Design a protein around this motif. Structure first.
Motif, PDB file in Angstrom:
ATOM      1  N   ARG A 338      -5.379   6.989   3.910  1.00  0.00           N
ATOM      2  CA  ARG A 338      -4.824   6.566   5.358  1.00  0.00           C
ATOM      3  C   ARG A 338      -3.161   7.125   5.655  1.00  0.00           C
ATOM      4  O   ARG A 338      -2.607   6.208   6.012  1.00  0.00           O
ATOM      5  CB  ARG A 338      -4.914   5.458   5.794  1.00  0.00           C
ATOM      6  N   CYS A 339      -2.979   8.059   4.867  1.00  0.00           N
ATOM      7  CA  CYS A 339      -1.401   8.605   4.953  1.00  0.00           C
ATOM      8  C   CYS A 339      -1.358   9.456   6.092  1.00  0.00           C
ATOM      9  O   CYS A 339      -2.099  10.398   6.446  1.00  0.00           O
ATOM     10  CB  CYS A 339      -1.064   9.068   3.748  1.00  0.00           C
ATOM     11  N   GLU A 385      -7.519  10.845   4.027  1.00  0.00           N
ATOM     12  CA  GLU A 385      -8.082  10.625   2.761  1.00  0.00           C
ATOM     13  C   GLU A 385      -8.017  11.683   1.976  1.00  0.00           C
ATOM     14  O   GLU A 385      -8.660  12.122   0.968  1.00  0.00           O
ATOM     15  CB  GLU A 385      -9.521   9.903   2.755  1.00  0.00           C
ATOM     16  N   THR A 432      -6.409  -1.565  -6.408  1.00  0.00           N
ATOM     17  CA  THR A 432      -6.292  -2.331  -4.838  1.00  0.00           C
ATOM     18  C   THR A 432      -5.703  -1.570  -3.928  1.00  0.00           C
ATOM     19  O   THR A 432      -4.500  -1.135  -4.210  1.00  0.00           O
ATOM     20  CB  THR A 432      -5.484  -3.871  -4.954  1.00  0.00           C
ATOM     21  N   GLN A 433      -6.129  -1.559  -2.685  1.00  0.00           N
ATOM     22  CA  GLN A 433      -5.462  -0.693  -1.708  1.00  0.00           C
ATOM     23  C   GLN A 433      -4.338  -1.311  -1.115  1.00  0.00           C
ATOM     24  O   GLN A 433      -4.255  -2.498  -0.677  1.00  0.00           O
ATOM     25  CB  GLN A 433      -6.124  -0.063  -0.412  1.00  0.00           C
ATOM     26  N   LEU A 434      -2.954  -0.912  -1.332  1.00  0.00           N
ATOM     27  CA  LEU A 434      -1.942  -1.456  -0.708  1.00  0.00           C
ATOM     28  C   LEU A 434      -0.885  -0.838   0.079  1.00  0.00           C
ATOM     29  O   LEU A 434      -0.912   0.407  -0.275  1.00  0.00           O
ATOM     30  CB  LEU A 434      -1.072  -2.034  -2.110  1.00  0.00           C
ATOM     31  N   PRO A 435      -0.312  -1.283   1.155  1.00  0.00           N
ATOM     32  CA  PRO A 435       0.545  -0.533   2.069  1.00  0.00           C
ATOM     33  C   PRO A 435       1.759   0.363   1.249  1.00  0.00           C
ATOM     34  O   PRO A 435       2.376  -0.475   0.392  1.00  0.00           O
ATOM     35  CB  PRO A 435       1.101  -1.518   2.944  1.00  0.00           C
ATOM     36  N   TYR A 437       5.296   2.976   2.121  1.00  0.00           N
ATOM     37  CA  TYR A 437       6.244   3.236   3.080  1.00  0.00           C
ATOM     38  C   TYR A 437       7.488   3.652   2.354  1.00  0.00           C
ATOM     39  O   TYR A 437       8.128   3.283   1.538  1.00  0.00           O
ATOM     40  CB  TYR A 437       6.550   1.847   3.761  1.00  0.00           C
ATOM     41  N   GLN A 451       3.822   6.724   5.620  1.00  0.00           N
ATOM     42  CA  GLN A 451       3.282   5.544   5.331  1.00  0.00           C
ATOM     43  C   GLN A 451       1.800   5.692   5.048  1.00  0.00           C
ATOM     44  O   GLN A 451       1.422   6.703   5.374  1.00  0.00           O
ATOM     45  CB  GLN A 451       3.556   4.554   6.472  1.00  0.00           C
ATOM     46  N   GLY A 452       1.116   4.829   4.510  1.00  0.00           N
ATOM     47  CA  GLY A 452      -0.372   4.782   4.292  1.00  0.00           C
ATOM     48  C   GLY A 452      -0.601   3.810   3.295  1.00  0.00           C
ATOM     49  O   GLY A 452      -0.029   2.767   3.412  1.00  0.00           O
ATOM     50  N   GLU A 453      -1.718   3.851   2.464  1.00  0.00           N
ATOM     51  CA  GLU A 453      -2.157   3.207   1.450  1.00  0.00           C
ATOM     52  C   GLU A 453      -2.139   3.796  -0.099  1.00  0.00           C
ATOM     53  O   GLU A 453      -2.229   5.009  -0.128  1.00  0.00           O
ATOM     54  CB  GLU A 453      -3.264   2.514   1.599  1.00  0.00           C
ATOM     55  N   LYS A 455      -3.615   3.398  -3.987  1.00  0.00           N
ATOM     56  CA  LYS A 455      -4.731   3.044  -5.077  1.00  0.00           C
ATOM     57  C   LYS A 455      -4.029   3.384  -6.306  1.00  0.00           C
ATOM     58  O   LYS A 455      -4.204   4.508  -6.855  1.00  0.00           O
ATOM     59  CB  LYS A 455      -6.145   3.168  -4.681  1.00  0.00           C
TER      60      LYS A 455
END
Ligand SMILES: CN(CCO)S(=O)(=O)c1ccc(N)cc1
Length: 460
Positions: A338-339, A385, A432-435, A437, A451-453, A455
């Protein structure tokens, strides 16, 4: 003999006013005088690295090295090794390190930038040094910027030319300027920013200094105000100033500020100012703590007082596994979900990303993102993705969580970076998906956001 996970770094800046120093300058290296000073109980404890920036330095490299080494030897009983020395005109940088660090220090680079054109080219600019300390990149910039209360814009221009053109650190990091090349970047010197108050207030300013009441002066310091308005030194830190203005003194005392206009000043007032500064920028979530920031009271050969700053800085070891370096570790991977980049550019070209990190064998180019229009006019570049899976050289979490990923967003049409930023792998969790930035800059100015997540998979 274990490798360190912290070192202390001394930063000095002194405009010597073209005069030889006095016979004793040990108070400088000991962080003694005014401001945030170093505890007496630490006096015999050497710093790991001493970085000395001078301006208006009248000495030969040899003459200054002899004074520095003999000073440190008297304080510490340690004979320091010379890492680097570089001089442009009368602007000089010296790096000294404890002898035990000689085989931890590599990839030593020096460079200089001359600022201004014709008239304004001939005495201002910057010198710099970079090197690796085990797995940690260190950069140091000593600049002497344009003088004069009414030239803060020129100073900001000098800053941008220095960060664009000073060629330090890893040349493979081609989209990145010095503000992204180093784990820890220290920028110091006679930055020449002034206390912007009316000339008629000179005696009032002096009064305030005698009372040690700096608040109403710092609120007019041009470096603080320009930094607040994001005109200069974006994303740099400075310790709170708790010492008197370091300019302009009568020589051979510290009892008098010499501020009135004179032929020798070009008929300019020099209201008491914090010309002499130390700032830094470290990668996100790396340990860096300022442990002193002040000025000496007993060194009076110049119209400036020496400034000191000391830091605790986190460092990493030169990691070797059974696998990397020299291959990948299939047990490690970095994924991006989700970037999207948000850019201020008015242009319509396609964009791609480059991921640069010493945890990769070489930099990674993404596919083009998908441009959309933001609600408030912006260009949003969506990667969804689609971003590649990054394959680190080492999967050990004790290594990988200490690393960083530099990001450049580049035009497909021109292959020019529109913005640079940095993402820490010091995550709250793995698998783990993490924010994530970072702000994006180009020539040190804000150009957007990424920004995004993330893993992150490590061997644990
Ligand atoms: C006053 N000074 C010595 C003679 O000039 S000094 O260099 O400023 C100093 C040295 C060590 C400590 N602990 C404190 C101050």
């Amino acid at each position: 003999q274990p490798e360190p996970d912290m070192i202390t770094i001394f930063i000095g800046t002194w405009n010597m006013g073209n005069a030889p120093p006095p016979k004793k300058i040990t108070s400088w290296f000991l962080s003694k005088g005014q401001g945030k000073t170093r505890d007496d109980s630490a006096d015999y404890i050497p710093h790991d690295i001493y970085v000395i920036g001078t301006q208006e330095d009248p000495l030969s490299e040899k003459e200054w090295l002899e004074i520095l080494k003999h000073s440190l030897q008297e304080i510490t009983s340690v004979t320091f090794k010379t890492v680097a020395i570089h001089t442009l005109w009368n602007i000089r940088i010296v790096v000294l390190a404890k002898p035990e660090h000689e085989n931890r220090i590599s990839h030593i680079c020096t460079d200089n930038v001359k600022t201004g054109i014709a008239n304004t080219l001939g005495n201002k600019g910057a010198v710099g040094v970079s090197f690796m300390f085990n797995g940690t990149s260190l950069g140091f910039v000593n600049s002497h910027l344009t003088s004069g209360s009414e030239k803060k814009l020129r100073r900001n221009q000098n800053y941008m030319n220095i960060l664009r053109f000073l060629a330090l650190g890893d040349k493979k990091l081609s989209p990145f300027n010095i503000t992204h090349r180093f784990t820890h970047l220290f920028w110091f010197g006679d930055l020449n920013y002034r206390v912007d108050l009316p000339t008629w207030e000179a005696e009032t300013i002096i009064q305030k200094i005698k009372q040690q009441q700096y608040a109403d002066l710092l609120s007019h310091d041009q470096l603080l105000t320009e930094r607040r308005e994001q005109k200069v030194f974006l994303h740099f830190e400075e310790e709170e100033i708790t010492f008197a203005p370091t300019y302009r003194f009568e020589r051979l005392t510290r009892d008098k500020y010499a501020y009135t206009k004179q032929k020798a000043t070009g008929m300019k007032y020099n209201l008491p100012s914090w010309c002499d500064r130390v700032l830094w920028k470290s990668y996100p979530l790396v340990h860096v703590v300022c442990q002193s920031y002040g000025s000496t009271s007993d060194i009076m050969t110049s119209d400036h007082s020496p400034v000191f700053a000391t830091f605790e800085a986190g460092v990493t070891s030169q990691f070797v596994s059974k696998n990397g370096p020299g291959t990948v570790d299939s047990q490690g991977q970095i994924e991006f979900l989700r970037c999207y980049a948000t850019l201020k550019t008015k242009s319509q070209t396609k964009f791609y990303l480059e991921f640069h990190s010493s945890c990769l064998e070489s930099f990674v180019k993404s596919q083009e993102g998908e441009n959309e229009e933001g609600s408030e006019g912006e260009l949003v570049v969506k990667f969804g993705e689609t971003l590649p899976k990054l394959k680190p050289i080492i999967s050990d979490p004790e290594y990988l969580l200490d690393q960083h990923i530099l990001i450049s967003i580049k035009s497909s049409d021109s292959d020019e970076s529109y913005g640079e930023g940095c993402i820490a792998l010091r995550l709250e969790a793995t698998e783990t998906q993490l924010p994530i930035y970072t702000p994006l800059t180009h020539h040190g100015e804000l150009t957007g956001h990424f920004q995004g997540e993330i893993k992150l998979q490590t061997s644990q």
